[PDB]
Amino acid sequence: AVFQQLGGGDVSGAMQDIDLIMDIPVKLTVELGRTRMTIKELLRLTQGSVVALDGLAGEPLDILINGYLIAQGEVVVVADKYGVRITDIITPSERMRRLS
Amino acid sequence: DIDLIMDIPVKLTVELGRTRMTIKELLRLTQGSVVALDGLAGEPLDILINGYLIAQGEVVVVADKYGVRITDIITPSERMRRL
Amino acid sequence: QDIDLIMDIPVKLTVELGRTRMTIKELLRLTQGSVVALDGLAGEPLDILINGYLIAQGEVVVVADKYGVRITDIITPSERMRRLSR
Amino acid sequence: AVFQQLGGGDVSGAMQDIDLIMDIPVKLTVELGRTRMTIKELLRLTQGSVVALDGLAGEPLDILINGYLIAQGEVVVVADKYGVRITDIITPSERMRRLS
Amino acid sequence: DIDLIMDIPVKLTVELGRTRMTIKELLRLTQGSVVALDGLAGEPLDILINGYLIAQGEVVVVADKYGVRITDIITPSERMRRL
Amino acid sequence: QDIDLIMDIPVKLTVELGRTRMTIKELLRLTQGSVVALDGLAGEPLDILINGYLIAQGEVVVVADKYGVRITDIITPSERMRRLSR
Amino acid sequence: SDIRPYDPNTQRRVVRERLQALEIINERFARQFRMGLFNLLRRSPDITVGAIRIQPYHEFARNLPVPTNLNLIHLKPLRGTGLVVFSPSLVFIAVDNLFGGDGRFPTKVEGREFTHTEQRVINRMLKLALEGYSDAWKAINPLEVEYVRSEMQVKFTNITTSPNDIVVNTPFHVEIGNLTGEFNICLPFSMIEPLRELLVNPPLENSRHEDQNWRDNLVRQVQHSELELVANFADIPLRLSQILKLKPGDVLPIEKPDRIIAHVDGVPVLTSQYGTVNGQYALRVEHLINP
Amino acid sequence: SDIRPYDPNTQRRVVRERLQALEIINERFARQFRM
């Protein structure tokens, strides 16, 4: 019974600003491609096998922060190091196009 | 019972890059900004199933469609090192 | 392979209330007096960690007017493996 | 029962000035580098072994007073004696970057 | 039981300098001021684990990354002299 | 190796209330009447030191209207070693 | 295994970064300075922009000749002090052309200093140079260029806290007739650093409204990203020896937590009082940790 | 082991310190004094 029971703390909610949370690390990840595939072919997979991805070659790649899609970029090579070039923040319409 | 889970669909992804950033950095990105990737060129791309890493493999393009060759399947010994 | 060499090194132990995963939206509109939950039921043993690595489990106990953690068990690697797996 | 029980002494708190505490010795220490490493490699260590540090070579070194990071400097050699050259007091943002 | 504490992470540091100063002196430091170090050049740098001294060793750079060679591990006989 | 040579040299003995570690912030806003604690429970024997070197332990005692330290023990080096270690 | 002893004061910090925005600002400034020089000297100069050099300050200092006119300039609101270096050859050519000379004789420099008339001519040239540079920067980032001081030696400037600091040098070569000269523009990297993302990518034909709309939409897109928030109830310091003997059933004493720090991946975001709500461990948020 | 008798009034206090700020003040003053 050490912990004190908190309740009724739903005072209000309003966005303050985006600098209170600024220096918080984000997990950025660029995605090469997607493919919907069942377990059928999944175990059929051996070493050296090739899995085709739904994404057409040369299309803009997807950029996610903490696993949430935010933007579409393009992959570039700078000094032998892989780099993405941000092209456009995705729209809600393409977000749902992605969902379906 | 294996037959039940031998047919189910699942979502597969392969990730090409991984970077850690603050928001000063994310906001600073504009249009055309190039973001460097911790991953070196030629290293095996992670392959994830519903966000769960199971394998590593190189990038290859077949018939003008993106693809990946499964170089190896990671044993959970490397998972400790993944964090 | 020395033993007395690191037999005295200090470590710092942390204990958590609980996990929770909540987006930038709710974090920005959190105000004073607002209440946010955690992923743990009130009663499970809290997780003790060192250098961000799981080490133990225990809960807080009230003896007289003083507080402390009553460790329940020590996690073997097998348990740690299922911790990461699920 | 010799000691008299003191209580309710929380009158107020206000910074006075930094010269009341001036001639107090500080423990200044410059840090070469850091590295997060587990006990695994720790005992593997023998005499003559080399431990790589996270800090890139030639980067500004860290200056602490009583173990608290205050500034970043650069190492110089003057008359065969090691010396650091203070370059910039760290910012709260880099402080937290260091923390994470 | 050794297995439990044979895997735990720990923070390692190596300190290059050590100086004692008053605040007149600390405040007097400005931008570009050079602060001398009690430590002579070439003496073994202290190596600390979570702020605890365990060893002494020289500074060496490998593959463009800072490093240190463990010259020796200090036995607690020198700890009395460390103070 | 003489003995009567230093048999008479005087030493000064100090006794502490307790340790505490507190930053510049709280030190500067300490005002008159403010109360600060120490790292020791009220009741443990205080540490007696000479030239900044631990020598004994004892607490204050009231006999009549006079005060003195009642030494509890003499610290052997082994204890001193664990004092530095922890 | 490559392992060599650590030697201080060695040029080991290499930071190579292409600066397209500076690469175009240099040509814009060169065009502006060419017509300014045509307007002043009543001649036809050609200015070739050299490769931008990213080098430690003492390399730039040692490559400079002595004496050379150095013009400390303030590129406000950027904190710092840039340098405009006019070679003896260029000022000699300008003075020769202004004072009744068709540059027939070869330029001779033998460590001769600069008189007051030469200093005034250099000030007149530097006014045009600074106007052109400000106009060139105006396209990308509007800056005001102020000339604060002129010097002749290298040890009087010290615009870098340390000689090993990294600076960005652009040498231009100005040719008039057969005569030639050069002049450099050096900016400490501290001034450029807040504008690195602007100076790195090549400029795009957009508008400030479009740019602010871009990050606005991106900001809104970022908001829908789940985070991991961790609450720390207590932090107790134990030795390794305690940890090995530590076994189930022990009690480790902790102090009163007045407030509970909530951090995301280490960075603290909240301090809030602990509690229990709906059978869940709850926190009553008290204060968002603003910087 | 170097051990020699203590002789007072001998120049034993050596304080060598480069003074860059004076090194530039000297040239500034020299230029002003020349004109």
Side-chain angles (χ1 to χ4, degrees), chain A residues 1-20 22-23 25-88 90-100, chain B residues 1-4 6-22 24-80 82-83, chain C residues 1-3 5-26 28-81 83-85, chain D residues 1-20 22-23 25-88 90-100, chain E residues 1-4 6-22 24-80 82-83, chain F residues 1-3 5-26 28-81 83-85, chain G residues 1-10 15-37 39-41 43-68 70-107 111-151 153-238 240-243 245-253 255-269 271-283 285-291, chain H residues 1-10 15-35:
Chain A
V2 175
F3 297 97
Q4 166 303 329
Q5 195 291 330
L6 278 172
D10 189 37
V11 198
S12 46
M15 180 171 174
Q16 293 176 335
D17 185 295
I18 200 43
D19 311 1
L20 295 104
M22 183 176 282
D23 289 345
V26 175
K27 183 178 179 180
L28 182 131
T29 187
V30 86
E31 184 178 2
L32 170 65
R34 293 181 295 103
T35 189
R36 151 71 41 81
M37 176 178 73
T38 166
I39 277 179
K40 284 290 183 217
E41 293 83 3
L42 191 44
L43 295 174
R44 293 182 183 174
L45 298 170
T46 88
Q47 312 324 287
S49 152
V50 164
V51 174
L53 295 161
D54 294 358
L56 184 68
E59 291 315 90
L61 272 68
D62 289 345
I63 286 175
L64 309 114
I65 46 142
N66 284 29
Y68 176 77
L69 177 63
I70 46 144
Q72 245 167 6
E74 183 178 2
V75 49
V76 75
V77 279
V78 295
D80 289 345
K81 190 55 126 181
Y82 267 7
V84 77
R85 163 197 287 122
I86 272 183
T87 66
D88 36 21
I90 86 172
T91 59
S93 87
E94 182 178 301
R95 179 170 294 107
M96 294 183 284
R97 201 281 311 291
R98 202 61 53 76
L99 200 155
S100 91
Chain B
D1 63 358
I2 313 172
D3 289 345
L4 170 65
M6 178 171 174
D7 181 57
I8 294 149
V10 76
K11 182 68 180 295
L12 188 153
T13 52
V14 48
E15 293 179 353
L16 198 72
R18 294 179 66 188
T19 295
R20 273 171 44 67
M21 283 164 72
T22 77
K24 186 200 306 186
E25 300 190 57
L26 263 193
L27 268 48
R28 295 176 64 186
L29 311 180
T30 57
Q31 190 156 22
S33 302
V34 168
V35 172
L37 295 169
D38 290 345
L40 198 41
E43 317 312 322
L45 289 64
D46 300 344
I47 316 186
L48 284 83
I49 308 295
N50 297 19
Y52 177 71
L53 210 156
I54 87 185
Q56 293 177 7
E58 67 185 342
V59 51
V60 69
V61 47
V62 278
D64 289 345
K65 298 183 71 68
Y66 274 146
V68 48
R69 174 186 337 249
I70 294 169
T71 60
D72 75 295
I73 284 87
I74 60 110
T75 175
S77 295
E78 287 86 67
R79 213 163 251 106
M80 294 300 293
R82 183 65 65 185
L83 295 174
Chain C
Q1 205 79 13
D2 308 341
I3 296 164
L5 159 49
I6 69 110
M7 179 67 181
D8 193 81
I9 294 169
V11 297
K12 291 174 65 175
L13 269 89
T14 175
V15 63
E16 295 177 339
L17 295 174
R19 281 331 199 198
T20 190
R21 293 182 183 174
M22 62 174 282
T23 61
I24 294 169
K25 183 178 179 180
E26 296 85 357
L28 295 176
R29 293 182 183 174
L30 274 184
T31 53
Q32 185 173 355
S34 58
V35 48
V36 47
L38 289 172
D39 295 343
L41 289 158
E44 293 179 353
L46 308 181
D47 289 345
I48 303 301
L49 282 102
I50 301 178
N51 272 54
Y53 176 77
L54 164 61
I55 192 69
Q57 290 180 336
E59 71 281 5
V60 61
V61 291
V62 63
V63 185
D65 59 356
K66 296 292 184 289
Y67 295 92
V69 301
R70 180 182 293 176
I71 303 301
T72 56
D73 80 271
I74 289 305
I75 311 95
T76 61
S78 62
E79 182 65 26
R80 186 170 294 106
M81 294 300 293
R83 298 294 296 163
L84 314 172
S85 85
Chain D
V2 175
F3 297 97
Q4 166 303 329
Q5 195 292 330
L6 278 172
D10 189 37
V11 198
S12 46
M15 180 171 174
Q16 293 176 335
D17 185 295
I18 200 43
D19 311 1
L20 295 104
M22 183 176 282
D23 289 345
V26 175
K27 183 178 179 180
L28 182 131
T29 187
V30 86
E31 184 178 2
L32 170 65
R34 293 181 295 103
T35 189
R36 151 71 41 81
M37 176 178 73
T38 166
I39 277 179
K40 284 290 183 217
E41 293 83 3
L42 191 44
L43 295 174
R44 293 182 183 174
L45 298 170
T46 88
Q47 312 324 287
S49 152
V50 164
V51 174
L53 295 161
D54 294 358
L56 184 68
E59 291 316 90
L61 272 68
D62 289 345
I63 286 175
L64 309 114
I65 46 142
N66 284 29
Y68 176 77
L69 177 63
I70 46 144
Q72 245 167 6
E74 183 178 2
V75 49
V76 75
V77 279
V78 295
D80 289 345
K81 190 55 126 181
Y82 267 7
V84 77
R85 163 197 287 122
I86 272 183
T87 66
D88 36 21
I90 86 172
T91 59
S93 87
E94 182 178 301
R95 179 170 294 107
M96 294 183 284
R97 201 281 311 291
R98 202 61 53 76
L99 200 155
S100 91
Chain E
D1 63 358
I2 313 172
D3 289 345
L4 171 65
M6 178 171 174
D7 181 57
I8 294 149
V10 76
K11 182 68 180 295
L12 188 153
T13 53
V14 48
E15 293 179 353
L16 199 72
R18 294 179 66 188
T19 295
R20 273 171 43 67
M21 283 164 72
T22 77
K24 186 200 306 186
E25 300 190 57
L26 263 193
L27 268 48
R28 295 176 64 186
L29 311 180
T30 57
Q31 190 156 22
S33 302
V34 168
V35 172
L37 295 169
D38 290 345
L40 198 41
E43 317 312 322
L45 289 64
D46 300 344
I47 316 186
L48 284 83
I49 308 295
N50 297 19
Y52 177 71
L53 210 156
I54 87 185
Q56 293 177 7
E58 67 185 342
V59 51
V60 69
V61 47
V62 278
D64 289 345
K65 298 183 71 68
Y66 274 146
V68 48
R69 174 186 337 249
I70 294 169
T71 60
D72 75 295
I73 284 87
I74 60 110
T75 175
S77 295
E78 287 86 67
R79 213 163 251 106
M80 294 300 293
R82 183 65 65 185
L83 295 174
Chain F
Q1 205 79 13
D2 308 341
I3 296 164
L5 159 49
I6 69 110
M7 179 67 181
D8 193 81
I9 294 169
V11 297
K12 291 174 65 175
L13 269 89
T14 175
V15 63
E16 295 177 339
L17 295 174
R19 281 331 199 198
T20 190
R21 293 182 183 174
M22 62 174 282
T23 61
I24 294 169
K25 183 178 179 180
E26 296 85 357
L28 295 176
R29 293 182 183 174
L30 274 184
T31 53
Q32 185 173 355
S34 58
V35 48
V36 48
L38 289 172
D39 295 343
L41 289 158
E44 293 179 353
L46 308 181
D47 289 345
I48 303 301
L49 282 102
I50 301 178
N51 272 54
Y53 176 77
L54 164 61
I55 192 69
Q57 290 180 336
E59 71 281 5
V60 61
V61 291
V62 63
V63 185
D65 59 356
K66 296 292 184 289
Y67 295 92
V69 301
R70 180 182 293 176
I71 303 301
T72 56
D73 80 271
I74 289 306
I75 311 95
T76 61
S78 62
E79 182 65 26
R80 186 170 294 106
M81 294 300 293
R83 298 294 296 163
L84 314 172
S85 85
Chain G
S1 64
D2 70 89
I3 166 174
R4 66 184 182 277
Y6 150 76
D7 191 6
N9 68 267
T10 58
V15 178
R16 55 182 181 86
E17 189 75 16
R18 179 70 176 289
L19 286 190
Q20 312 268 353
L22 256 187
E23 284 276 14
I24 78 147
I25 286 171
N26 288 168
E27 295 302 320
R28 262 167 166 83
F29 156 75
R31 163 156 272 95
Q32 216 86 353
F33 197 44
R34 165 203 293 240
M35 295 297 103
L37 276 206
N39 186 25
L40 185 150
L41 277 97
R43 290 292 308 270
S44 166
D46 57 332
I47 316 183
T48 79
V49 175
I52 288 172
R53 304 173 190 170
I54 296 100
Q55 53 200 10
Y57 173 79
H58 61 78
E59 208 73 26
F60 169 58
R62 75 205 328 180
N63 291 323
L64 270 203
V66 50
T68 299
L70 277 66
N71 305 278
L72 303 173
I73 51 153
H74 277 164
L75 292 183
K76 312 198 254 315
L78 296 199
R79 293 182 183 174
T81 290
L83 177 56
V84 172
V85 175
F86 279 140
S87 297
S89 323
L90 209 161
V91 309
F92 195 102
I93 291 168
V95 168
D96 181 23
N97 274 243
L98 294 174
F99 285 96
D102 289 345
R104 292 181 66 172
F105 315 98
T107 185
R112 181 177 65 83
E113 293 177 350
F114 294 167
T115 57
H116 280 276
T117 64
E118 291 214 348
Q119 175 68 41
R120 207 78 61 82
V121 167
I122 294 169
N123 288 340
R124 174 100 60 70
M125 272 177 31
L126 175 90
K127 167 194 193 42
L128 306 176
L130 294 203
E131 268 166 356
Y133 207 67
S134 189
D135 299 348
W137 262 95
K138 184 180 68 65
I140 287 172
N141 193 24
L143 300 176
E144 57 184 341
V145 190
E146 276 90 336
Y147 156 64
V148 305
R149 180 145 61 74
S150 148
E151 295 302 320
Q153 294 300 320
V154 185
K155 57 198 167 51
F156 296 161
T157 58
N158 283 334
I159 67 105
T160 61
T161 56
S162 89
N164 269 358
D165 279 88
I166 187 79
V167 304
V168 173
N169 186 359
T170 304
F172 312 80
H173 300 347
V174 184
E175 276 82 5
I176 294 169
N178 44 318
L179 310 161
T180 189
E182 60 186 340
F183 79 96
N184 312 42
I185 293 185
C186 163
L187 298 193
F189 212 76
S190 300
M191 297 180 27
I192 271 171
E193 250 303 312
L195 307 188
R196 181 179 180 274
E197 80 278 8
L198 195 32
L199 281 160
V200 158
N201 44 9
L204 295 174
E205 287 324 285
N206 264 25
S207 95
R208 320 302 290 284
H209 177 66
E210 295 166 82
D211 289 345
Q212 186 173 355
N213 189 30
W214 163 275
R215 181 177 65 83
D216 184 1
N217 303 309
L218 177 63
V219 175
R220 308 184 305 93
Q221 290 334 287
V222 160
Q223 285 159 16
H224 313 133
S225 70
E226 65 183 1
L227 294 174
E228 183 178 2
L229 187 59
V230 182
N232 285 342
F233 177 80
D235 191 21
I236 65 197
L238 295 174
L240 191 147
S241 64
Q242 321 195 33
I243 313 308
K245 62 180 68 180
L246 189 147
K247 293 179 179 179
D250 305 359
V251 174
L252 302 159
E255 202 32 70
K256 293 179 179 179
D258 289 345
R259 293 178 179 83
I260 303 301
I261 294 169
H263 66 106
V264 172
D265 214 322
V267 170
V269 186
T271 59
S272 53
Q273 290 177 324
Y274 45 106
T276 43
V277 63
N278 293 338
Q280 277 325 89
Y281 282 126
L283 313 98
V285 175
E286 257 206 48
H287 181 16
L288 279 158
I289 319 172
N290 43 25
Chain H
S1 64
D2 70 89
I3 166 174
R4 66 184 182 277
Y6 150 76
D7 191 6
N9 68 267
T10 58
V15 178
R16 55 182 181 86
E17 189 75 16
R18 179 70 176 289
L19 286 190
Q20 312 268 353
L22 256 187
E23 284 276 14
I24 78 146
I25 286 171
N26 288 168
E27 295 302 320
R28 262 167 166 83
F29 156 75
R31 163 156 272 95
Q32 216 86 353
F33 197 44
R34 165 203 293 240
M35 295 297 103

